[PDB]
């Protein structure tokens, strides 16, 4: 049954994702909840926009919650009469319909992959969350005589699976580390800024890999016309028109994507700020650090493991960088604020009628917040300031660092250059919000003039591995 | 003075316990508070049952606490007229009287031991909490010519003290690790369940060691009739009647012991749930792990040290076992719950008259609890899932593990088999509550048919160390 | 320009302090805020004493904060009419005027030092917080031919800078470790007490080093009359009169210094008790541990580093010392208190009208505090009591320990002797409050009779390093 496939690339990617999804039911259940998140976001916002009145809620006998909710009939009439609301719902509906159809097709294709694990590999569906990818890899390669998926190539190789699954991610890796993508900016008042988000990466792969107008012929071979240097300018002009058109589509989609990014950050992170706002000060590896620190032919879990082992030294390293002025001001401000708040607390503690004076509680509240915030920049008085050993621990995991980091490991410039590989989480959120606005501008003015250079790139750094196809240079 | 003892076994146990009690006053003070805990439990429950009225408390001028308390005369009349309350108090009184008489006798016997530390060993009572058992051991054995406690045996030996103190605990160890005690069960809806509590261990030692009808003649020699195989069936029948009778006593005592176990768990753990309920999710070594992981000839502190060194790796190991479905549901539920709660919090934060709507606070409260509970099953996104090194650290301390744990260290079955050696604290509490109900059933139907096998056991695995007596096989 | 200095001692101290102050602006900004702290303390207390009325605050329409504040005119009239308040303000004004004049002079002298870093060393003012003292040390010593600050001595040496900056701190070190200063006391009800504060150290340096009547001629040479033993008694009598006079000045200043110490502890620590009172239970290295554990020729940062590396093992070591009686009482008290509080919480949880009974909340509140306090003396049940390895880790950093600590590392006496080198923070605060009262008594009765011994000391342990001057013996 596993002979007429013709799409071994997509097949191996699906074989890997089911292992990364911890079986079949979790993938199905995970996909359903993904679809449900969008629908819930849309429905709750729509319900909040139309049904609830907010008049009898602010009161302008105890009132129940169901009173503020309008009955179904009047809520439907206000939705279908907003005009400026139904036009967003229509677009948010067609994307989900496309997604749902794609999902149904993927289920019917992942069920076929399920049989291949069960039958060809003899690995039950209850042992997946306990089977490393290495175990799955040995049974696929050693039994390649039975299922005879690839008879065309003389044999199958471990390097082949890595190349087949990751034919386009290697291309993505080569573009960012050769500065062939517009991800460096100079800003007035900020200085150097690296703006690399998921929209640009999604757009790069859509411009270069996916679509009927991309550089790749079917799935695993870029069009032969891109292997001849006789029409570099003509191909560049054609690519420039393509790049220009994709940017126009992004500019058209700007308002919709902005609503989606805003809604996602709010529904996902606007509650952690209330309960534990220090979690958004905790740092995480940025998307550039995932493409700058990524080896060639390295799967998602092999890289995620390295970013996990180097997560605790990185928090310490970024936390040993203080500021003589910030530390001075924090020390002094905490003293002054706490010295006033202590008197206030004593007058409050003795007789509590002071709590009825107008601006006593707010002053105490803001000062408690002020003391706690200011006392958070004051380090532990007996810490071992060792910001030189911290880089050793980090480099032992992520494996990549600019050459001007080893000696001067403690300057304020090295921290500001490391903070771009290891960014705040709050900063991460903020540039996910700005991605749908800046991404089109980046593609039209910065990437379009490079449309020639890319054409040279794809022409000079693409080799042809026999039996595999057109792959990216290491 | 230390020549006419005739009970060197009990003497050495008392010598050890005073060191484990950190001197003499602490033992006296500890015993008094132990007696006082029972009396307080009984008295407070009795006072709550009879004196307080709960009528003028629920209000059916500010009211004081002493108003709800009835005067002594009317409270005494209601106690001595309850009938169904005085019959429990009588039993709770006679046990304490027995305990108090035993305590007074033990004090007069521990005072004699106090003189032996002070005079024979020349160790002051202010240096006990700072003297290891090794220091006490060297001065006892090296000065065995002066106090001449044991002249019968040619000399005294360190192995002898371990054997003399622990003649019955070794027997307890051999029964659990040879599955000679009924502590394995199959339950519909739960599967495998190991139910081993203090009542069974107390009952085992009462059936086998203590009492005038046990297997041991005086204190340190089982009756010679149990060394002849000519009457195995007859001895088994006699033992079966004994086992049957002990079970009947337990069945009779079931309601009383149940009240004691319920009261003890409530008074000891029902407040930690309110303040810090995560402490009852913290795991602890179960009573079977104390008998399965216990070496032979190992005192209480030597084992407690090993269970201490292996406590932190064990919490990590049991905490690295997740569930693809539980983690998926938690992630998704937290998002949905937090997404609703964030909107609620914003409407609450803007104008607080929303706080007067009926079901807004309860929804917020349950959802905050829901988010916090659900967000507690979501691991740290950058943790080093290394559940294989954790078993190495644990095995280096407790020294005992089933053979099918080394290879498959990460299956869901190994965790469910390790959770029986290292059980939850909440689970520990729950099976202490169920011990007085299930313990009689275990003894009558499961241990009684084994009454023959035990007779064989005690006949084949009991050696006679010269000068020491009848000991258990290692 | 760096030739006519004549005060190389003060110059090198200033060169070091600017590095310890992380540049020039931070020193200027730090000094200004230091001056501002005193002024704010005085002004706020004065404003609180005179302006606010506390009559319309305790209420004896919602009332604003500005109503309680008296207008400027009536507040000025009450200040300048208090009599017993203006006499304190005058003294608190003249000290600050002296301080401000000294500060202005130091700025004009540190600006000259700023040019020496910028020009002679070619080290910009933006690289100071990132330059170790070693980098500053190499450029000073290797370029000693250009600025020719010291041509008198043949060359400059690293030992010379250490000696020049720290000519008086070495003297302070030799007096405390030879028990030549009155810092040991026997108290009824407390026993041994080591009372060494900043006032005594400040007074010691004022009696011995600073002033026109001290032992040192100009700055770096004690008067030659103190190098001849022919007038030991006469010099001792003169020194005794000096010591007596300094003590009289301290006794006169007792009330003022007491107000300053009280105010400083309150404004600095009286708020941490409210928010996080466990931070004042955290220990810190006492002032005697800074003079007992200090090497010879060791700068402030080299010692602070050692006190930082040995801070975490020291907290563990002092936290592994329990008390059999304290642990027993805590266990039992927590059980009893929690057993009552659990019943109270259940009655409170079922129906909340119980919250209106008078003494229910206070009982719950005090018992919650009681449980939390008592449950703070109860250690973790599975901790590795290893108070012997902890001393190894500590001694590896502070380098100094009494000889009767190595063997008996766990007695209650070693802890009570280590607690004097590593004292509580709350204890530290308390003896800073008592320093202005006890310091004069210590100098008059204990140090005055020693006035002879000191004269012998300064005569026998002062060597003359050529080119450097009169230094202290190592």
Curated annotation (Swiss-Prot), chains A, B, C:
Molecular function via GO: phospholipid scramblase activity
Membrane protein topology class: Multi-pass membrane protein
Intramembrane residues: 244-254, 273-281, 424-433, 437-445
Record has Endoplasmic reticulum as a keyword: yes
Catalytic activity: a 1,2-diacyl-sn-glycero-3-phosphocholine(in) = a 1,2-diacyl-sn-glycero-3-phosphocholine(out); a 1,2-diacyl-sn-glycero-3-phospho-L-serine(in) = a 1,2-diacyl-sn-glycero-3-phospho-L-serine(out); a 1,2-diacyl-sn-glycero-3-phosphoethanolamine(in) = a 1,2-diacyl-sn-glycero-3-phosphoethanolamine(out)
CC per GO annotation: autophagosome; endoplasmic reticulum membrane; endosome; Golgi apparatus; Golgi membrane; intracellular membrane-bounded organelle; late endosome; late endosome membrane
Broad class of where this protein is predominantly found: membrane
Lumenal side: 50-81, 351-359
Ranges in the topological domain labelled Cytoplasmic: 108-243, 255-272, 282-324, 378-423, 434-436
Gene Ontology biological process terms from the UniProt entry: autophagosome assembly; bone morphogenesis; innate immune response; mitophagy; negative regulation of interferon-beta production; negative regulation of macrophage cytokine production; piecemeal microautophagy of the nucleus; programmed necrotic cell death
Localization per record: Preautophagosomal structure membrane; Cytoplasmic vesicle, Autophagosome membrane; Golgi apparatus, trans-Golgi network membrane; Late endosome membrane
Post-translational modification note: Ufmylated in a DDRGK1 dependent manner.
Keyword terms of this UniProt record: Acetylation, Autophagy, Cytoplasmic vesicle, Endoplasmic reticulum, Endosome, Glycoprotein, Golgi apparatus, Lipid transport, Membrane, Mitochondrion, Phosphoprotein, Transmembrane, Transmembrane helix, Transport, Ubl conjugation
TM ranges: 27-49, 82-107, 325-350, 360-377
Signal peptide (from-to): none
Cited function: Phospholipid scramblase involved in autophagy by mediating autophagosomal membrane expansion. Cycles between the preautophagosomal structure/phagophore assembly site (PAS) and the cytoplasmic vesicle pool and supplies membrane for the growing autophagosome. Lipid scramblase activity plays a key role in preautophagosomal structure/phagophore assembly by distributing the phospholipids that arrive through ATG2 (ATG2A or ATG2B) from the cytoplasmic to the luminal leaflet of the bilayer, thereby driving autophagosomal membrane expansion.
Domain notes: Forms a homotrimer with a solvated central pore, which is connected laterally to the cytosol through the cavity within each protomer. Acts as a lipid scramblase that uses its central pore to function: the central pore opens laterally to accommodate lipid headgroups, thereby enabling lipid flipping and redistribution of lipids added to the outer leaflet of ATG9A-containing vesicles, thereby enabling growth into autophagosomes.
Family under the similarity heading: Belongs to the ATG9 family.
Assembly mode: Homotrimer; forms a homotrimer with a central pore that forms a path between the two membrane leaflets. Interacts (via cytoplasmic its C-terminus) with ATG2A. Interacts with SUPT20H. Interacts (via the tyrosine-based sorting signal motif) with AP4M1; promoting association with the AP-4 complex. Interacts with ARFIP1 and ARFIP2. Interacts with PI4K2A and PI4KB. Interacts with ATG4A; the interaction is direct and promotes ATG9A trafficking.
Protein name as catalogued: Autophagy-related protein 9A
Source species: Homo sapiens (Human)
Phylogenetic lineage: Eukaryota, Metazoa, Chordata, Craniata, Vertebrata
Gene that encodes the chain: ATG9A
